[PDB]
Amino acid sequence: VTEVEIDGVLHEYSTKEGVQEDILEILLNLKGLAVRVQGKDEVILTLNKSGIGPVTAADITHDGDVEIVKPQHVICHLTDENASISMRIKVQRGRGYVPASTRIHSEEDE
Amino acid sequence: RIRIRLKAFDHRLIDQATAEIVETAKRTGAQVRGPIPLPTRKERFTVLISPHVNKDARDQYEIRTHLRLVDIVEPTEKTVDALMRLDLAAGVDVQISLG
Amino acid sequence: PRRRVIGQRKILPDPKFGSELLAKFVNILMVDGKKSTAESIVYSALETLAQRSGKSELEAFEVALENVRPTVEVKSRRVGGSTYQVPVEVRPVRRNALAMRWIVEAARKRGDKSMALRLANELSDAAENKGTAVKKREDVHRMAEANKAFA
Amino acid sequence: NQYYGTGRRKSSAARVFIKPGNGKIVINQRSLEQYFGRETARMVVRQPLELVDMVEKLDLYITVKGGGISGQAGAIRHGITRALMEYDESLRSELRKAGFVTRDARQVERKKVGLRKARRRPQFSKR
Amino acid sequence: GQKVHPNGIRLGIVKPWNSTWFANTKEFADNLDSDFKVRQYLTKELAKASVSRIVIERPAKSIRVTIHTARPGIVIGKKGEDVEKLRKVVADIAGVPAQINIAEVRKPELDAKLVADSITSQLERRVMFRRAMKRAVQNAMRLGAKGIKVEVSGRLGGAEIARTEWYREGRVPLHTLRADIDYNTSEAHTTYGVIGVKVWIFKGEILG
Amino acid sequence: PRSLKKGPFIDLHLLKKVEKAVESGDKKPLRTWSRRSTIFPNMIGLTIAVHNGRQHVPVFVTDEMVGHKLGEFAPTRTYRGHA
Amino acid sequence: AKQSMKAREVKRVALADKYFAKRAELKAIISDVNASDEDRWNAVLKLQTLPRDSSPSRQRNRCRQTGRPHGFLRKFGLSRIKVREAAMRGEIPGLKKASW
RNA sequence: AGAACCUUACCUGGUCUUGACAUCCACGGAAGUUUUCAGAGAUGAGAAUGUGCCUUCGGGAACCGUGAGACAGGUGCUGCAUGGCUGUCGUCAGCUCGUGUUGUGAAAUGUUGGGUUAAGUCCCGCAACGAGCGCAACCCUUAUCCUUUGUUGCCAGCGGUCCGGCCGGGAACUCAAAGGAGACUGCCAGUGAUAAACUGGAGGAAGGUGGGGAUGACGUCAAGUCAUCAUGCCCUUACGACCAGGGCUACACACGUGCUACAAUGGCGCAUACAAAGAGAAGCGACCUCGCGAGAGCAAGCGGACCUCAUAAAGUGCGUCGUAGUCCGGAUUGGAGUCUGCAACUCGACUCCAUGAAGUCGGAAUCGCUAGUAAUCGUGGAUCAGAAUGCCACGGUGAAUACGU
């Protein structure tokens, strides 16, 4: 996971309506994710879910060439039934460790 | 068999789409027919370019609609469904048709 | 033109006799790019002509042509106040063409019914040394003779 | 065994096949005399063969599409030439001399805005 | 009206399209109309925000707008407050689900349209047109444009007889198709009349 | 002319007026703009002032005028001569 | 074009939208050879009664931006002049200058 | 890139005046839905249904109604106030600048000169040295090849046959796109100033910019357009708005651009062959049935390499006419009708039967075209209910001539 895009958010240190984990907790639990793409080298997934209960990794509306190999990876704990969450993840492919500070100016595509 | 009609204005984009579709097909199912290029529609237009009058003054535009016919011979359980989540790049109208 | 002389384009010989000249003649005859009809007409003319004069189809035609070819034509220089027509020796390629053209013109003029027939008649006349094309040729020559002082 | 050459001239596209035989020409399941009513066309299709004495030696099956008659004939001729080239590869020079190896690239010039045709400009007047 | 439009001649090669969608003859006109509307709205809204290029892209009955702007901060406002607001109106305009993206324009002195806009603004607030033009040219050059041209036309300094003046610097090849020529235009609605500003900015040649 | 299957054309209002006139047995001229209206057998005897664009011109209907239209007997343009 | 003209056009369009079902039906009735004469007559008269602006052959195709009646194109819904502008700007997808 | 109505901006009448089109409040009513008489219509008067999103209830946002004004509206004037867009010389090879130098200076030089080129193209020289915009190249298309992928496209070799690629199939060929290769005076000889080049030839599908298109320098014409659009005085119970009818189609005449002719290289009749490129859902409409025909009825196939428009015509073969104002020519007019359309009177197209003008190659003069060009033959498209001989496209056949300045 490289870029996470949640709707109705300002920064990662805010909080959201209807969830348990805070947004830094959500970003950590998304950093632990294990994805296996086949054809492309950069894909965009989608997670949309409402209702009371935990948000597994098995709730992501998969495409054809992406395979999420951990169907019990928890991300959120939605508590309000009127709460919703719609995040759009971006999954690149590389090696080593490239962090946010160096990837703050390295990124060319404005 | 699933016939797939890709239509787009940009040819490169269309090509990219086609490849992607093939990839999607080939991992899940087996015996993808192939990316067959149909004839391109070159819909031309002439217009007078003056605001008022000068009739020999003209611009001749066109829109090149490209066609790609991809066919899938064996629709399995896994394969057909894979396209639902697998949306293609924008500016490429796809048209799947089983049988 | 000013800049560059160009090589004359390739001409196919006619299917019946295998002749370049004949083909050229046919082309000259032709109108509205209806080549086939024109060629048929030409053939008809030849056949009738052949029947009339004996010989061959081609040979007779050649003979006819020979009696209408101009040795010398004139051109207008006009360097002075009034115009002076000057004679000039007309080249092999051109002379042949001119005769053919004249013949065609004569045929067009002529009061007989079918085109082919008219053409045949013209050819016959040429062979004998009477008719329209021959007259034209004579006139051309005559003019040249008159203006022989200029050279 | 059958040898082959593609023919093309104007909007015509001939598919000439050369085989060893007696010299019978078939164009779209019709004889040369049936298909080409025109003598000129016939001549053009026979030209290359005439040039290199193989009229009696080889049969040729043809199928041609597109264009008119003359164009079609030309295409056929071209195809034949190609076939010959493929087959012998020592008759090339003769063909070149003739002018049959050359694809006649003359297409019809497009109509151009302003003009009535490819080059015919409309009638001009100062007044 | 001598010259061909520099963007328009290059759409197949080095320049891309703004509206990027497919549609059949049925829905195409409507789509175009929608695009026109939304774009118009955006221009009206984000006038004070320096906006260069609106790129519309609609897949699967849902419109994706991409606003290229020099300062995202004024277009976004507070994080997801202004953008969100924009989105619903865009959707309304279209009649479909909307999605607004905002691209940040690096080097607004090299973006031609932006420059033109700036010039227009200057003209409106009664500066010496010539000095503005000079500034435009100079700045671009400083920033690393291979070349720039700007042209302004009509009622310059409120003069009765209209004229055009233009400043070029560096190289601005227009006949060369592979040249990245960012062209754009604007109009200063002054007290004496309109003053049209054209500007060509040559980023460099593309090799492919 | 109009198709035979469609029938003849007359403006509804005009027709109504004609009917009224017939009922009455009056011979005061009916001013009308329907130049496109065909003349009918029942209209014979009536004066009907047809518009010519400018003014209403009186047309006493006759047995011969039936198949024709009202605009045929109310010329619009007014050319006398060039000299 | 004027605003007024545009408004008129819009009105016409609206009318067309409204009265389509009825008008079409009437037309069908008129056509239908296997039908009564009186009925046909009624239909013909009925049609007359309906508003004129209800006809689709009344409404003129104008440019969607400027309302210019002439020089129109159907695919784009725009007059030539505007279409060209759009093309130049990149606003019409796929459209570029053609040469052959 | 299409005037019956509409369009329409004009005329005649009939009407409206915060208005047909917007924003704003005030307050009367949910919007809207159906129907009635008068009227040319615009409009002016009636009968049925509904009360949705929310209220410490002075009410609201959509959508009608009325009055006030703020304003709307103007295809009204100025293109000699303008922007934008366009023509034009001219796709003509030119037009400039910086720094240096020359001249009191306007200016010059570069940019001239020797050659050469399609080219201010390139070389060589030289008080110039450099640079930019243009001349070229990059882009599309067309001409040859290769790779990839083969249906709705193809059928070389295989088997079957209703002798139809139609059905097993085959992936060859055509064709279809996508990606590469190829042409650069690169190779050879001579001429040339130890050059740039030129002349020829070899190969090659293509040869010297291969053919065609797009591309239009600085500028010129106070060139065109305020009626596309935008934009810096005038009208505002009317130079604004609605309506019906008429006009834009008038006709002593003059000019422009086209079509069709005057015939036998032809007309007519019967048979019969070979295209390309396009369009199509309020759409293209097979087959079959009826109609002399335009068409009508029924009604599949098809958002389309599949189905439809859709028979290409000139051509070819056989017959006839035999140089006549004709079996040339079709105008004109009468009758009767078909389709579109509320509606074909003014004023549509097409059909059938009749009618059968002028015209026998055109005065002075005057235009186009150098090749797949002209000439001629059909085909399609846009606008478009309908309405092209125009415009924009497509292929068929297919010349003549260029000595030269």
Residue D119, CB, less than 7 Å from strand H? yes
* Residue found by looking up tokens 């040469």 in the block: G99
Contacts for C29 with CB less than 8 Å, ≥ 6 apart: C38, C41, C42, C104, C107, C119
Helix (H, G, I), strand (E, B) or coil at C39: helix
Chain C residue with CA closest to D99: the answer is C10
**E22 closest CB neighbour out of B9, B49, B50:** B9
**Chain E contact present for A3, CB below 8 A:** no
Contacts for D7 with CB less than 8 Å, ≥ 6 apart: D13, D14, D15, D16, D64, D74, D75, D76, D77, D78, D79, D80, D82
User: Left (φ > 0), alpha (ψ -120 to 50) or beta: where does E155 sit?
Assistant: left
Among the listed residues A75, A77, A89, A78, the one whose alpha carbon sits nearest the alpha carbon of residue A37 = A89
DSSP one-letter code for A6: E
Residue C11, CB, less than 7 Å from strand H? yes
Residue spans per domain, chain D: 1-127
Contact assessment for residue A86 and residue A7, using Cβ atoms and an 8 Å cutoff: yes
- Distance (Å) of CA G28 to CA C85, D58, G42: 82, 68, 13
**Chain B contact present for A96, CB below 8 A:** no
The nucleotide lying nearest B35 (C-alpha to C1') is: H149
| Cβ-based burial of A48 (10 A; exposed 0-12, middle 13-18, buried ≥19) | middle
Chain G contact probe: residue of F4, F5, F34, F36 with most G CBs at under 10 A: F5
Paired strand residues for E103: E68
Burial code (b: 16+ CB inside 10 Å, e: under 16) for C94-127 equals ebbbbbbbbbbebbeebeeeebbbbbbbbbbbbb
Paired strand residues for G79: G72
- Residues of chain B with Cβ-Cβ distance to A39 below 8 Å are 20, 23-24, 27
Contact D99 C10 (CB under 8 A): yes
Contact assessment for residue A46 and residue A62, using Cβ atoms and an 8 Å cutoff: no
**Element (DSSP H or E) covering residue F48:** strand F48-51
Chain E contact probe: residue of G92, G95, G100 with most E CBs at under 10 A: G92
User: Left (φ > 0), alpha (ψ -120 to 50) or beta: where does C104 sit?
Assistant: alpha
Residue G59, CB, less than 7 Å from strand H? yes
Here the tokens at position E27 are: 């829905």
Here the tokens at position G96 are: 């570029």
- Distance (Å) of CA C45 to CA A27, D50, G97: 99, 28, 55
Here the tokens at position B85 are: 């989540």
Here the tokens at position E201 are: 């900015």
First to last CA, chain E: 32
Cα atoms in the 13 Å half-sphere on the side-chain side of E43: 12
Phi, psi angles (nearest 5°) of residue C125: -60, -45
Q: Is position C15 within any domain?
A: no
The single-letter code of the amino acid at G99 is S
Distance F1 CA to H334 C1' (A): 14
E54 CB neighbour count, 10 Å cutoff: 22
Range of the domain at C50: 20-147
CATH of the domain at B38: 3.30.70.600
Report the alpha-carbon distance of residue A4 to residue D29 in Å, rounded: 68
E87 with E141, same domain: the answer is: no
Q: Is beta strand C85-89 parallel, antiparallel or unpaired with respect to C72-76?
A: antiparallel
First to last CA, chain C: 24
Contact assessment for residue F22 and residue F42, using Cβ atoms and an 8 Å cutoff: yes
Residue E198, CB, less than 7 Å from strand H? yes
3-state secondary structure chain E: CCCCCHHHHCCCCCCCCCCCCCCCCCCHHHHHHHHHHHHHHHHHHCCCCCEEEEEEECCCCCEEEEEEECCHHHHHCCCCCHHHHHHHHHHHHHCCCEEEEEEECCCCCCCHHHHHHHHHHHHHCCCCHHHHHHHHHHHHHHHCCCEEEEEEECCHHHCCCCCEEEEEEECCCCCCCCEEEEEEEEEEECCCCEEEEEEEEEEEECCC
Query: Which single residue has its CA nearest the C1' atom of nucleotide H278?
Result: B43
E81 with E118, same domain: the answer is: no
Contact C36 D44 (CB under 8 A): no
First to last CA, chain D: 71
- Residue E189 C-alpha from the chain's centroid: 17
Show which positions of strand H are touched by protein (CB under 7 A): 1-2, 5-9, 11-12, 20-21, 33-34, 39-42, 72-75, 79, 81-90, 118, 131-145, 149-152, 155-157, 173-179, 199, 203-206, 210-220, 222, 224-232, 240-247, 250-252, 255-258, 264-266, 273-282, 296-297, 303-305, 312-317, 322-323, 337-346, 366-376, 382-386, 391-405
Contacts for F6 with CB less than 8 Å, ≥ 6 apart: G44
Contact assessment for residue D91 and residue D85, using Cβ atoms and an 8 Å cutoff: yes
Contact assessment for residue C93 and residue C105, using Cβ atoms and an 8 Å cutoff: no
DSSP one-letter code for B87: P
Number of domains in chain B: 1
F10 CB neighbour count, 10 Å cutoff: 19
E143 CB neighbour count, 10 Å cutoff: 14
Here the tokens at position G48 are: 């007359």
User: Within window 114-153 on E, which residues have Cβ closer than 7 Å to strand H?
Assistant: 147, 151, 153
* Residue found by looking up tokens 């009917």 in the block: F19
Contacts for E123 with CB less than 8 Å, ≥ 6 apart: E129, E132, E152, E188, E190, E195, E197
Contact assessment for residue A39 and residue B26, using Cβ atoms and an 8 Å cutoff: no
Range of the domain at F30: 2-82
Paired strand residues for E54: E67
Helix (H, G, I), strand (E, B) or coil at G72: strand
DSSP one-letter code for F52: -
The single-letter code of the amino acid at E208 is G
Contact assessment for residue G31 and residue G44, using Cβ atoms and an 8 Å cutoff: no
Measured CA angle at D69 (ends D65, D73), to 5 deg: 75
**Chain B contact present for A88, CB below 8 A:** no
The nucleotide lying nearest C26 (C-alpha to C1') is: H399
User: What are the helix (H) ranges across chain D?
Assistant: 32-35, 39-51, 70-87, 92-98
Range of the domain at B64: 1-99
Here the tokens at position E56 are: 């519309």
Contact assessment for residue E75 and residue E37, using Cβ atoms and an 8 Å cutoff: no
- Distance (Å) of CA F25 to CA A21, A58, F42: 98, 94, 12
Report the alpha-carbon distance of residue C27 to residue C38 in Å, rounded: 8
**Chain B contact present for E22, CB below 8 A:** yes
DSSP one-letter code for F28: -
Helix (H, G, I), strand (E, B) or coil at D40: helix
Residue F2, CB, less than 7 Å from strand H? yes
Report the alpha-carbon distance of residue D9 to residue C149 in Å, rounded: 54
Among the listed residues G58, G76, G82, the one whose alpha carbon sits nearest the alpha carbon of residue G1 = G82
The nucleotide lying nearest B49 (C-alpha to C1') is: H86
**Chain B contact present for D113, CB below 8 A:** yes
Number of domains in chain F: 1
Contact assessment for residue E56 and residue E68, using Cβ atoms and an 8 Å cutoff: no
Q: Is beta strand E63-69 parallel, antiparallel or unpaired with respect to E98-104?
A: parallel
Chain D residue with CA closest to B57: the answer is D114
* Residue found by looking up tokens 């949640």 in the block: A6
CA dihedral A93, A96, A100, A104 (to 10 degrees): -70
The single-letter code of the amino acid at D46 is R
Among the listed residues E28, E15, E179, E64, the one whose alpha carbon sits nearest the alpha carbon of residue B63 = E28
Task: Calculate how close chain G gets to E154, using CA atoms only, in Å.
Answer: 21
Chain B residue with CA closest to E25: the answer is B43
- Distance (Å) of CA C145 to CA C76, C91, C149, G65: 15, 18, 8, 78
Report the alpha-carbon distance of residue F60 to residue G34 in Å, rounded: 40
Q: Would you tell me which residues 11-70 of chain C have a C-beta closer than 8 angstroms to some C-beta of chain D?
A: 12, 14-16, 35-36, 39
* Residue found by looking up tokens 């602006």 in the block: G53
* Residue found by looking up tokens 């605001």 in the block: B51
Q: Is position C6 within any domain?
A: no
Resolution of this deposited model, Å? 3.7
Helix (H, G, I), strand (E, B) or coil at D23: coil
Helix (H, G, I), strand (E, B) or coil at C34: strand
Q: What count of residues does chain A have? A: 110
Residue G56, CB, less than 7 Å from strand H? yes
Here the tokens at position G98 are: 């053609």
Q: What count of residues does chain G have? A: 100
- Residues of chain A with Cβ-Cβ distance to E80 below 8 Å are 7-10
F74 CB neighbour count, 10 Å cutoff: 20
| Strand stretches in chain A, DSSP E | 3-6, 35-37, 43-44, 47-50, 53-56, 66-68, 74-78, 84-91
Helix (H, G, I), strand (E, B) or coil at C38: helix
CA dihedral F23, F25, F26, F27 (to 10 degrees): 120
User: What are the helix (H) ranges across chain F?
Assistant: 12-24
Report the alpha-carbon distance of residue C18 to residue C4 in Å, rounded: 32
Chain D contact probe: residue of B56, B59, B60, B62 with most D CBs at under 10 A: B56
Paired strand residues for D65: D13
Among the listed residues E208, E207, E201, the one whose alpha carbon sits nearest the alpha carbon of residue E7 = E201
* Residue found by looking up tokens 């994080």 in the block: E79
* Residue found by looking up tokens 């019978």 in the block: D24
Here the tokens at position F5 are: 């299957």
Chain F residue with CA closest to G49: the answer is F12
Range of the domain at E196: 107-206
Helix (H, G, I), strand (E, B) or coil at B33: strand
Report the alpha-carbon distance of residue A15 to residue A6 in Å, rounded: 11
Number of domains in chain A: 1
Contact assessment for residue C71 and residue C142, using Cβ atoms and an 8 Å cutoff: no
Report the alpha-carbon distance of residue A24 to residue A2 in Å, rounded: 14
- Residue E124 C-alpha from the chain's centroid: 18
Report the alpha-carbon distance of residue E104 to residue E108 in Å, rounded: 10
CA dihedral E181, E182, E183, E189 (to 10 degrees): -160
Report the alpha-carbon distance of residue B55 to residue B57 in Å, rounded: 5
**Chain B contact present for G21, CB below 8 A:** no
Report the alpha-carbon distance of residue E88 to residue B45 in Å, rounded: 36
What's the farthest any 2 CA atoms get from each other in chain B?
63
Report the alpha-carbon distance of residue G92 to residue G86 in Å, rounded: 6
Contacts for G5 with CB less than 8 Å, ≥ 6 apart: G62, G67
First to last CA, chain F: 37
Residue spans per domain, chain G: 1-90
The set of chains that have 3 or more CB pairs under 8 A with F is G
B63 CB neighbour count, 10 Å cutoff: 20
Phi, psi angles (nearest 5°) of residue D18: -105, 130
